[PDB]
Design a protein around this ligand. Structure first.
Ligand SMILES: *[C@@]1(=O)C(=O)N([C][C]C2=[C][C]=[C][C]=[C]2)C2=[C][C]=C(F)[C]=C21
Ligand SMILES: *[C@@]1(=O)C(=O)N([C][C]C2=[C][C]=[C][C]=[C]2)C2=[C][C]=C(F)[C]=C21
Ligand SMILES: [Cl-]
Ligand SMILES: [Cl-]
Lengths: 187, 187
């Protein structure tokens, strides 16, 4: 049976960090739900790209649980994720059930906000390090992608393909990740 | 004064190849118009990401001309661009006025369809080479980004950052491209 991904899309999300994982995961045969934090309406991303979510978060939650919950970055998107009681509940449920959580750029700071995966080795965007490390709840890494058990983190738009393919490898295996990678013309 | 970019968005466009250049160009302070080929309505991309264009092509044309016209790939998106009389007219005008034209993945095959930039060195996605080379109107390159004067081409999702930054360098210079690049966490 196919694996399922929930991508939580908030105003101010980094659109590259949203679209790259959604696209790459669909290439891998993952069933991806782009879920709007604020409802069903189109979402204005950080660089003004407007994306129409597949569903509201409220609705997508009802079709859970998911094999991965994906948190894009963007400072303002991550703040919105960080402030959301609905995200808190989703992430706590996912952690509790030992499901994967993946977050990129400023996205990992939402893990801090919601007290998720304390003790993990994580990375973030370099500019988000101090926020992530407030209280020393995680151990910091400069790896482009960091995976510490069920906590998978990455750094920025330029690591989005690696992040996405790490998600694919985690859910569908190395061979599928390699197959999906080759047509992308990655360096 | 700020440079201006027209990104032509058709059904079946590769969403990564659309969003990466739009975002990176906006980071560079370029005024970018995402123009829907079919009108003002949301566009269903190749991997089902739905993007709301800033304007119809019809409307965006009226605010021309642009310092660059950008053609994303995706096989079906490129076919739609290739079949469009409106795109033909836009590209001929751009070529005639010696403005930049940039196309990625299968996007360059629209240049062939509309008889644009014959004689140029070009690249495409590897799977789009034979289509592009039908009649030997161009010279083929395996460079990740190829720029032959005002014809700028690239290969796939994995070359989208390089493609975008090449556009930025062409319009705004090497120093701006370097400044925009550094926060992206590119390899
Ligand atoms: C990335 O998508 C993101 O989340 N970034 C924000 C990092 C940050 C900046 C200031 C304070 C806290 C966090 C970010 C920045 C730059 C970039 F290119 C991508 C991203
Ligand atoms: C890319 O975005 C694109 O346009 N691709 C289509 C290439 C092509 C395939 C078959 C026949 C003609 C052209 C393509 C393919 C794979 C990929 F990963 C990205 C793109
Ligand atoms: Cl940001
Ligand atoms: Cl395609």
């Amino acid at each position: 049976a196919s694996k399922r991904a929930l991508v939580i899309l908030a105003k101010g999300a980094e659109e590259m960090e949203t679209v790259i994982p959604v696209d790459v995961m669909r290439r891998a045969g993952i069933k991806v739900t782009v879920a709007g934090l604020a409802g069903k309406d189109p979402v204005q991303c950080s660089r003004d790209v407007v994306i129409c979510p597949d569903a509201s978060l409220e609705d997508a939650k009802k079709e859970g649980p998911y094999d991965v919950v994906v948190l894009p970055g963007g400072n303002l998107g991550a703040q919105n994720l960080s402030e959301s009681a609905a995200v808190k509940e989703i992430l706590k449920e996912q952690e509790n059930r030992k499901g994967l959580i993946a977050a990129i750029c400023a996205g990992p700071t939402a893990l801090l906000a919601h007290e998720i995966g304390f003790g993990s080795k994580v990375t973030t965007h370099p500019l988000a390090k101090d926020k992530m490390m407030n209280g020393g709840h995680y151990t910091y890494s400069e790896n482009r992608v960091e995976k510490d058990g069920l906590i998978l983190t990455s750094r920025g738009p330029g690591t989005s393909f690696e992040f996405a393919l790490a998600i694919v490898e985690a859910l569908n295996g190395k061979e599928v990740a390699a197959q999906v990678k080759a047509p992308l013309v990655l360096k």
